[PDB]
Amino acid sequence: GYVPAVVIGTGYGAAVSALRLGEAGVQTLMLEMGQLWNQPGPDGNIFCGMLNPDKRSSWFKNRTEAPLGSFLWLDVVNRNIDPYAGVLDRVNYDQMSVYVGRGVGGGSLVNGGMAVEPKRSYFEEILPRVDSSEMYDRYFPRANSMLRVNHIDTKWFEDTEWYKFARVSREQAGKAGLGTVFVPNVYDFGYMQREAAGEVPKSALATEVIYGNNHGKQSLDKTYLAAALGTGKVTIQTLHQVKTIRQTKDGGYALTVEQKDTDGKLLATKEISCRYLFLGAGSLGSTELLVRARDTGTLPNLNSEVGAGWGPNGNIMTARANHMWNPTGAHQSSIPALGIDAWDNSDSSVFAEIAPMPAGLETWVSLYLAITKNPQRGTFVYDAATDRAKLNWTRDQNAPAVNAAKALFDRINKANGTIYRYDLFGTQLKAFADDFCYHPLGGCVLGKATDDYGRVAGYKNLYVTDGSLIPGSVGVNPFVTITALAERNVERIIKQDV
Numbered sequence: 001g002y003v004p005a006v007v008i009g010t011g012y013g014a015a016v017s018a019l020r021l022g023e024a025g026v027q028t029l030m031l032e033m034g035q036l037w038n039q040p041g042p043d044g045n046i047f048c049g050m051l052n053p054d055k056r057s058s059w060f061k062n063r064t065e066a067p068l069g070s071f072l073w074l075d076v077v078n079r080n081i082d083p084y085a086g087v088l089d090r091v092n093y094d095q096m097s098v099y100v101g102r103g104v105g106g107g108s109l110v111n112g113g114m115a116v117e118p119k120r121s122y123f124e125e126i127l128p129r130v131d132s133s134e135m136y137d138r139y140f141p142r143a144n145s146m147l148r149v150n151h152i153d154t155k156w157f158e159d160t161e162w163y164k165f166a167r168v169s170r171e172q173a174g175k176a177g178l179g180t181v182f183v184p185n186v187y188d189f190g191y192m193q194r195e196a197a198g199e200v201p202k203s204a205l206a207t208e209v210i211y212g213n214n215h216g217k218q219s220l221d222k223t224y225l226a227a228a229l230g231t232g233k234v235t236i237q238t239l240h241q242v243k244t245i246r247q248t249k250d251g252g253y254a255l256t257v258e259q260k261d262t263d264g265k266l267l268a269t270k271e272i273s274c275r276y277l278f279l280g281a282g283s284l285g286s287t288e289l290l291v292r293a294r295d296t297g298t299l300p301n302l303n304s305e306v307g308a309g310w311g312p313n314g315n316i317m318t319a320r321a322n323h324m325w326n327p328t329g330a331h332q333s334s335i336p337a338l339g340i341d342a343w344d345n346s347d348s349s350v351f352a353e354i355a356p357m358p359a360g361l362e363t364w365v366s367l368y369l370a371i372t373k374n375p376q377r378g379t380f381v382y383d384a385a386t387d388r389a390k391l392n393w394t395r396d397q398n399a400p401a402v403n404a405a406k407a408l409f410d411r412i413n414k415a416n417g418t419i420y421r422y423d424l425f426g427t428q429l430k431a432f433a434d435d436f437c438y439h440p441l442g443g444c445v446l447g448k449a450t451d452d453y454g455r456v457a458g459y460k461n462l463y464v465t466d467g468s469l470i471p472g473s474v475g476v477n478p479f480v481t482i483t484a485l486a487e488r489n490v491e492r493i494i495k496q497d498v
């Protein structure tokens with residue numbers, strides 16, 4: 001079958017693109033390899049919590065895993081599971097594990113909701129060919145409104161047990177001269193206040209986030225994708241994974257698409273063709289499709305920048321042991337509200353999330369997800385033998401990121417007479433987790449693999465829309481940037497190309 005436009009994936013880039021295509025009257029099919037998350041499970045909820053992981057937690061794994069930072073307290077709840085089309089996929093490369101969402105809404109299903117604009121001067125540094133005025137005057141505000149970004153009530157924040165953990169780190173940071181900032185979110189903070197009051201079913205306040213939130217979080221299925229479906233011009237097919245892309249002889253695109261069940265069994269393989277093809281399969285998924293197409297000869301005119309320029313947004317996790325007089329609380333909202341902004345665009349920059357921990361008892365640990373400025377980049381290299389695009393990143397490539405995170409938290413420790421935890425990541429003494437990524441960026445970089453609007457070099461009517469466009473780093477949690485860039489891009493593409 002033929003459809004005018006196909007969008008691969010249903011994350012941020014995809015969702016923006018499909019909404020605007022549908023509003024423009026372009027009949028659009030979205031193909032999502034994961035599930036539509038709307039069926040109550042065996043506990044009556046759609047998603048499993050972090051204290052009760054089951055097969056819904058994991059994309060085709062045989063055992064649940066603890067949230068990073070929390071193995072010491074949450075390994076006790078791990079269990080063997082059947083490989084299943086669950087919501088969170090730990091993708092293992094040789095020296096890097098990248099975590100991604102799988103389902104209608106992509107990473108919006110599993111992420112912490114943190115909705116942050118990058119510093120304009122940093123945006124201008126990383127993407128000098130893009131008009132920063134339209135981004136800050138038009139596309140960032142548009143994204144914030146459509147995403148349903150909202151702001152925590154500061155009096156509630158100050159008073160509630162559920163944010164003690166955040167207030168402790170604010171106080172400790174302050175002794176080192178370092179400031180915090182409130183971080184806007186797509187989790188409804190009014191709902192969260194009502195959870196604390198016992199008035200509505202808990203989600204953030206019942207140790208849910210990374211395997212989905214049963215309530216409160218305005219993931220993309222509720223925002224952009226609901227609106228896209230509302231146009232009457234967009235449909236979504238789930239458990240459909242695009243495997244290959246080719247150009248037809250008349251300049252359209254044809255896809256091989258596998259349909260599976262939730263156990264992973266192959267039900268059918270279909271050919272889908274289109275006029276306009278939009279990739280929204282993520283940093284990993286879009287890049288793999290294009291590297292595969294180049295190196296197996298189905299899109300032979302793709303350039304050498306396809307696959308290049310990947311970075312983990314400088315992601316590093318670390319933790320501090322608090323004084324006994326500074327407990328962080330047994331009750332910690334799963335949605336962060338505060339960060340430490342020590343980002344000045346130099347190589348010592350750090351923007352850190354003050355991360356909650358789900359243990360549910362007092363541990364005195366403060367956890368942080370640092371975002372750093374590390375120029376190292378990796379490349380996805382096609383392995384024809386296994387048919388996989390393998391990220392060649394080495395752990396030593398994160399040394400600059402570790403060094404920046406360590407310098408910042410050493411200041412905090414010095415000012416407070418505290419030490420790191422060394423036991424949260426494995427039994428070897430390791431204070432800094434340096435081989436994970438929640439924020440994969442790059443692989444199909446804007447202006448390198450594509451033009452300045454994500455048009456893939458070498459091809460007409462072929463677009464990349466997602467985190468693969470970003471040059472490895474944005475200095476903040478990335479989805480607002482992905483969303484705003486996608487607003488900019490699809491608007492231009494519809495005007496000039498469609």
Ligand SMILES: Cc1cc2nc3c(=O)[nH]c(=O)nc-3n(C[C@H](O)[C@H](O)[C@H](O)COP(=O)(O)OP(=O)(O)OC[C@H]3O[C@@H](n4c[nH+]c5c(N)ncnc54)[C@H](O)[C@@H]3O)c2cc1C
Pocket residue numbers: 008009010011012013014031032033034099100101102103104105106107108110111112113114115116210240241242243280281282283285286289438439440466467468476477478479480482
């Ligand atoms: C634990 C965790 C916490 C995070 N916290 C935050 C946060 O608070 N704030 C923030 O700004 N960011 C956060 N992020 C990152 C954010 O979720 C991520 O940058 C965006 O989701 C990336 O959006 P994309 O559109 O690039 O991409 P993404 O959302 O990953 O969507 C790609 C979609 O394409 C699907 N797909 C992939 N390949 C195929 C294929 N071949 N055929 C069909 N479908 C396919 C895939 O299943 C998925 O649904 C977090 C992520 C994680 C994992």
